[PDB]
Amino acid sequence: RGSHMYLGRILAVGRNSNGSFVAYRVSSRSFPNRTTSIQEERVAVVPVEGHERDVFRNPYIAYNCIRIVGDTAVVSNGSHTDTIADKVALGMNLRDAIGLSLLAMDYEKDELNTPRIAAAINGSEAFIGIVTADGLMVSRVPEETPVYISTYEQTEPAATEFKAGSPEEAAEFILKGGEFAAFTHPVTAAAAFNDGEGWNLATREM
Amino acid sequence: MYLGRILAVGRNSNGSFVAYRVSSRSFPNRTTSIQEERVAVVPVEGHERDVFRNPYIAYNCIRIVGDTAVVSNGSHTDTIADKVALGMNLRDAIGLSLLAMDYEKDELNTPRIAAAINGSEAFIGIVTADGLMVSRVPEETPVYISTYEQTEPAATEFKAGSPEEAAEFILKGGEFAAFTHPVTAAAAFNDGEGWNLATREM
Amino acid sequence: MYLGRILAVGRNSNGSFVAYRVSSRSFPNRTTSIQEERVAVVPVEGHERDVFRNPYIAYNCIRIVGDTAVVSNGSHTDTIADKVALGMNLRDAIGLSLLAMDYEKDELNTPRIAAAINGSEAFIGIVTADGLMVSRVPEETPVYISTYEQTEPAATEFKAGSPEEAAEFILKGGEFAAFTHPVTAAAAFNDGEGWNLATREM
Amino acid sequence: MYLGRILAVGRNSNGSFVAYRVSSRSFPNRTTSIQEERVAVVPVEGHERDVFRNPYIAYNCIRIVGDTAVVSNGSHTDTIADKVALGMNLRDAIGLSLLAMDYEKDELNTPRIAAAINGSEAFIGIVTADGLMVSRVPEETPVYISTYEQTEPAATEFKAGSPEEAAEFILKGGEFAAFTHPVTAAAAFNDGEGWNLATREM
Ligand SMILES: NC(=O)c1ncn([C@@H]2O[C@H](COP(=O)(O)O)[C@@H](O)[C@H]2O)c1N
Ligand SMILES: NC(=O)c1ncn([C@@H]2O[C@H](COP(=O)(O)O)[C@@H](O)[C@H]2O)c1N
Ligand SMILES: NC(=O)c1ncn([C@@H]2O[C@H](COP(=O)(O)O)[C@@H](O)[C@H]2O)c1N
Ligand SMILES: NC(=O)c1ncn([C@@H]2O[C@H](COP(=O)(O)O)[C@@H](O)[C@H]2O)c1N
Numbered sequence: 001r002g003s004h005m006y007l008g009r010i011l012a013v014g015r016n017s018n019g020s021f022v023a024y025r026v027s028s029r030s031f032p033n034r035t036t037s038i039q040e041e042r043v044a045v046v047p048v049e050g051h052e053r054d055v056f057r058n059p060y061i062a063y064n065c066i067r068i069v070g071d072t073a074v075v076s077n078g079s080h081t082d083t084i085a086d087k088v089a090l091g092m093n094l095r096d097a098i099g100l101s102l103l104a105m106d107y108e109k110d111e112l113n114t115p116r117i118a119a120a121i122n123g124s125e126a127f128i129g130i131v132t133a134d135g136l137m138v139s140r141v142p143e144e145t146p147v148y149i150s151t152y153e154q155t156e157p158a159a160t161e162f163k164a165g166s167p168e169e170a171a172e173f174i175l176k177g178g179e180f181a182a183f184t185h186p187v188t189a190a191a192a193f194n195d196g197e198g199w200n201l202a203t204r205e206m
Numbered sequence: 207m208y209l210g211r212i213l214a215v216g217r218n219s220n221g222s223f224v225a226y227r228v229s230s231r232s233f234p235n236r237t238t239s240i241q242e243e244r245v246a247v248v249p250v251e252g253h254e255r256d257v258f259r260n261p262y263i264a265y266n267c268i269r270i271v272g273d274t275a276v277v278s279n280g281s282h283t284d285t286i287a288d289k290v291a292l293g294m295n296l297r298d299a300i301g302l303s304l305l306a307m308d309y310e311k312d313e314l315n316t317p318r319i320a321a322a323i324n325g326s327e328a329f330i331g332i333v334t335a336d337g338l339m340v341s342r343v344p345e346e347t348p349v350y351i352s353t354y355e356q357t358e359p360a361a362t363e364f365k366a367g368s369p370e371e372a373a374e375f376i377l378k379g380g381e382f383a384a385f386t387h388p389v390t391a392a393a394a395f396n397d398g399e400g401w402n403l404a405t406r407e408m
Numbered sequence: 409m410y411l412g413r414i415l416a417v418g419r420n421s422n423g424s425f426v427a428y429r430v431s432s433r434s435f436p437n438r439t440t441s442i443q444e445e446r447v448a449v450v451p452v453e454g455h456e457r458d459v460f461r462n463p464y465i466a467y468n469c470i471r472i473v474g475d476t477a478v479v480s481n482g483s484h485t486d487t488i489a490d491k492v493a494l495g496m497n498l499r500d501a502i503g504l505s506l507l508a509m510d511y512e513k514d515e516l517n518t519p520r521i522a523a524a525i526n527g528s529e530a531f532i533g534i535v536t537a538d539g540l541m542v543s544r545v546p547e548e549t550p551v552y553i554s555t556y557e558q559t560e561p562a563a564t565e566f567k568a569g570s571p572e573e574a575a576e577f578i579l580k581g582g583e584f585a586a587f588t589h590p591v592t593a594a595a596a597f598n599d600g601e602g603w604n605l606a607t608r609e610m
Numbered sequence: 611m612y613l614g615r616i617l618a619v620g621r622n623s624n625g626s627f628v629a630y631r632v633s634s635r636s637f638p639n640r641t642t643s644i645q646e647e648r649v650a651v652v653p654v655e656g657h658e659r660d661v662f663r664n665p666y667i668a669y670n671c672i673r674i675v676g677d678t679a680v681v682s683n684g685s686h687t688d689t690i691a692d693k694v695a696l697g698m699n700l701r702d703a704i705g706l707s708l709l710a711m712d713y714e715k716d717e718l719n720t721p722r723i724a725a726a727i728n729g730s731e732a733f734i735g736i737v738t739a740d741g742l743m744v745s746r747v748p749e750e751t752p753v754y755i756s757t758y759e760q761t762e763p764a765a766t767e768f769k770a771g772s773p774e775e776a777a778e779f780i781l782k783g784g785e786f787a788a789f790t791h792p793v794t795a796a797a798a799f800n801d802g803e804g805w806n807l808a809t810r811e812m
Contacts, residue, residue, distance in 0.1 A: 052658050079685070082665075086712060093495040099305050099338050100504070103298065104710030106692055127337070135329070136301050139337030254456045257466075261486075264459075281483065284463075288510055295697040302706070306508035308490055500709065503742050507705045531741070539733070539745030540705050 006184045007150035009077035011065075012174055013119035013126055014146025018165035019195035020121055021146075022075035023174035024065040027185045031061045036190040036203040041068040042081075043190040043201055060108050066192050068199045073192045076118035077151055080105045084118055094120045094127040099138045102131035115151050128157050148174070150183075167193040167202030175204050208386045209352035211279035213267075214376055215321035215328055216348025220367035221397040222323055223348075224277035225376035226267040229387045233263045238392040238405040243270040244283075245392040245403055262310050268394050270401045275394045278320035279353055282307045286320055296322045296329040301340045304333035317353050330359050350376070352385075369395040369404030377406050410588045411554035413481035415469075416578055417523035417530055418550025422569035423599040424525055425550075426479035427578035428469040431589045435465045440594040440607040445472040446485075447594040447605055464512050470596050472603045477596045480522035481555055484509045488522055498524045498531040503542045506535035519555050532561050552578070554587075571597040571606030579608050612790045613756035615683035617671075618780055619725035619732055620752025624771035625801040626727055627752075628681035629780035630671040633791045637667045642796040642809040647674040648687075649796040649807055666714050672798050674805045679798045682724035683757055686711045690724055700726045700733040705744045708737035721757050734763050754780070756789075773799040773808030781810050 012023045026034060026045055033051040037044045043066040047054045055062045060078055067074040067085035072094070074085040080101045087097040098118050108114040119128035119141065129138035130149055139157065141147055146162040149155065160179060164170035170191035174180050190203045214225045228236060228247055235253040239246045245268035249256045257264045262280055269276040269287035274296070276287040282303045289299040300320050310316040321330040321343065330351055331340035341359065343349055348364040351357065362381060366372035372393035376382050392405045416427045430438060430449055437455040441448045447470035451458045459466045464482060471478040471489035476498070478489040484505045491501040502522050512518040523532040523545065532553055533542035543561065545551055550566040553559065564583060568574035574595035578584050594607045618629045632640060632651055639657040643650045649672040653660045661668045666684060673680040673691035678700070680691040686707045693703035704724050714720040725734035725747065734755055735744030745763065747753055752768040755761065766785060770776035776797035780786050796809045 046662070052662070055661060056652070056658070082715075083710060083712075086715060087500070087710075090500070090712075091495060091497040092500060095337060096305065096491070096494070096496060100710050103301050103305060104689060104693075104706050106689075106696075109688075109692060129337075135297060135331075135339070135341035137337070137339045137341070139339070248460065254460075257459060258450065258456070284513075285508060285510075288513060289508075289702070292510075292702070293697060293699040294702060298693070298696070298698060302508050306487060306491075306504050308487075308494075311486075311490060499741060503709050507702065507709060537746075539701060539735075539743070541741070541743045541745070543741035543743070 004153050005182055006152060007154050008114070008152040009117070010148060010150040010174060010180070010183065011075045011077065011117055011119055012146055012148035012160060012162055013075060013121050013128055014141055014162060015143065016146060016162055016164065019193055020073070021164065021170050021191060021193045022066060022073045022119060022121060023162070023170045023189065023191040024075050025174045025180070025189040026187045027183060028187050029185055031058065032185070032187050034061065034187055035205065036065070036188045038201050038203060042066060043203065045188065060110060060114065066190055066201065068192060072120055072122040073194065073199055074118070074120045076116065078108065078116050080116050080118060084120060088120060094122065094125060095138055098127050098129040102129055102138065103136055105131070107132050115155060117149050117151060130155060164193065165195070167191045167200045168204065171202045171204040175206070207384065208354060209356050210316070210354040211319070212350060212352040212376060212382070212385065213277045213279065213319055213321055214348055214350035214362060214364055215277060215323050215330055216343055216364060217345065218348060218364055218366065221395055222275070223366060223372045223393060223395045224268060224275045224321060224323060225364070225372045225391065225393040226277050227376045227382070227391040228389045229385060230389050231387055233260065234387070234389050236263065236389060237407065238267070238390045240403050240405060244268055245405065247390065262312060262316065268392055268403065270394060274322055274324040275396065275401055276320070276322045278318065280310065280318050282318050282320060286322060290322060296324065296327060297340055300329050300331040304331055304338055304340065307333070309334050317357060319351050319353060332357060366395065367397070369393045369402045370406065373404045373406040377408070409586060410556060411558050412518070412556040413521070414552060414554040414578060414584070414587065415479045415481065415521055415523055416550055416552035416564060416566055417479060417525050417532055418545055418566060419547065420550060420566055420568065423597055424477070425568060425574045425595060425597045426470060426477045426523060426525055427566070427574045427593065427595040428479050429578045429584070429593040430591045431587060432591050433589055435462065436589070436591050438465065439592045439609065440469070442605050442607060446470055447607065449592070464514060464518065470594055470605065472596060476524055476526040477598065477603055478522070478524045480520065482512065482520050484520050484522060488524060492524060498526065498529060499542055502531050502533040506533055506540055506542065509535070511536050519559060521553050521555060534559060568597065571595045571604045572608065575606045575608040579610070611788065612758060613760050614720070614758040615723070616754060616756040616780060616786070616789065617681045617683065617723055617725055618752055618754035618766060618768055619681060619727050619734055620747055620768060621749065622752060622768055622770065625799055626679070627770060627776045627797060627799045628672060628679045628725060628727055629768070629776045629795065629797040630681050631780045631786070631795040632793045633789060634793050635791055637664065638791070638793050640667065640793055641811060642671070642794045644807050644809060648672060649809065651794070666716060666720065672796055672807065674798060678726055678728040679800065679805055680724070680726045682722065684714065684722050686722050686724060690726060694726060700728065700731060701744055704733050704735040708735055708744065709742055711737070713738050721761060723755050723757060736761060770799065771801070773797045773806045774810065777808045777810035781812070
């Protein structure tokens, strides 16, 4: 609880007065040598130059954290981002797409049984989910307020006043803004924002 | 106050168990029936027809497979029990079944709830129009969930030392006495020598 | 020669369709019933009781959801149609449902078969004690599958220009005339103006 | 003539096994590596970078979990093995993983194939843009499948009495000698005293 301010990987999703969004932040202790990279309609969490090797030491440190498929934004702390986005692309409602992926992928097999978390949002709805050694949960994001979840400590949706009017601001906020400023070991962050004219990506370093 | 269908699962000083209770307004003409290693919620004599009016009112609410007890408010009881029987951990068996079956397509989008318990662990789950949830039942305390209102696990001091008592308790005992429209209930208890079934009417 | 429950799906010069036929030995006291956008296989008057003896004899064999027709030999018809209704491509909808429901737990491990078809594509699938299979129906030709013997898609020249004809054909027409113990059949046809239902008795 | 990634599974007079072979044109700079109870297909020194160009070229092709051997052409090897480890029959473990993972999103929609074998049974499966298939491997004979051309189980007289021989055979032996672009292979054999791993280069 209280003295444990290290949430590990964090993601937020929802809508505010300026538009819809998904934010993601990498918090790490054992692998801080990483950054976010923007590529065609996706943001990848990858090793910074010199540490390419790391992906061979740990299979959970490199993955697309954000995938944009049509009007849908997908965010997750691992390779399941692709699993989910692909299902949405091929036609599958958000809840099931997240549910099926997490159920199959399951929690990560590391020394902490690190959970797999994810969220997806489109024009009319948004869902957030997590899978751990103790269970599986996927739930509708209340339209009334953005929420966030992490792999450690905050392993269930938590309401948050996420103020941001662009992907750059969104990424900066989950990295240093509001309640997120208190969560330790920030490394890198990324976000996708949609003010109505489409999904835009952005990244932010410390 | 009207929770609709209710189920509880967990362990107490006397043993392990699953309890189930039918609460209904539109279909109160039902009872529980014990058959080989399962308890079915069925129409009382004269209303056989009902199953043809509504496809969610008749189903096995309890299935015993080996050392595992399965309880649910619908046909997914069989979907889950079958997977356990064929080898699948409780969490996934409940998760896969609920994900596929989904909430019931009635005027209320009535959720599908379920729980399963064996010698070492127990899980409880629910699927609704707003999501899916399957979670480990804390060994420290029994829990219960319903299709309406109490749509998330809630701790309960479930005192019972037999299937008969367990069934009677979810039907009229403790906090359950306040939940309206009781119709019928059933339960499975295991004091260590195996699963036993029982039913209780109002 | 006794294939048990049979279903066909595909397109011909007159339109798209799904046909279903009940072949039975132990439960021949059944018929098809048309209700809102679905066809149910149910007991004929006097045998309502049967559904309580065997849980696999009564179920919707056909469900129409928007531009999609779904057909299957069991309750998974609803599981699949619901997923399509909520947005899920045909292949996955059939795949997920069969994977979860699994083969029927009777003395024969009777397989669960299904097919779904819409404006652009169609899929057919089956799940048995030996595996799971879901595949794209070739646009070049209609196919059919059964719970016994013909447990894999088989091409068929399915001539029919209406649901009535389609139902009659899978019941007595072509190659289907040779399959024993026909009881009842139903079908859904779409000539471009929408899905229409029909049933045919012996 | 070019089958791409290939895997075989089954039993012969000497024991049980799973073999895997990487055939490639665009990425031939790879080898197999043995680590604790698993074999990984990885880039040879100097090409570490490749994994960042294509996400489907590096993955564990073989995982041993207890008495079970798992083989696949991609990261789903871990998805399947993990489910078996946590308790899930082989058919479902392969089915669920393939259904979720789906075919690879490359310029060829490269299928995901897999197989798993333990003391009593074995299953093989594949998922492609046209469908999903998981089926019981006949005990009477070993089978193999590939991502291209041979996209359905094919019987094979797989002679081998050790992991080394098994790996060598799928790489250059029998019918496999005719399949083009061999790069590296690996295998797991169980003569009754446990699973042993081995790799073979050209
Ligand atoms: N998703 C990630 O970026 C990630 N980074 C690390 N991990 C897992 O969590 C473990 C501990 O991470 P850390 O010590 O940075 O909190 C790592 O060893 C790995 O197994 C992840 N899931
Ligand atoms: N589980 C049950 O026994 C059950 N009984 C009814 N129902 C569904 O809930 C609806 C409302 O039931 P009630 O009026 O008992 O609250 C019914 O129309 C039906 O769709 C059930 N799922
Ligand atoms: N789908 C059906 O209509 C059906 N009817 C019967 N059955 C199952 O197959 C068994 C054998 O049926 P029959 O004797 O008609 O070949 C029945 O006892 C039951 O378990 C079915 N699946
Ligand atoms: N599993 C593998 O080893 C593998 N190697 C390559 N591939 C995918 O198949 C594509 C074509 O492979 P190739 O060019 O070797 O026939 C590659 O570009 C990649 O997308 C694989 N799945």
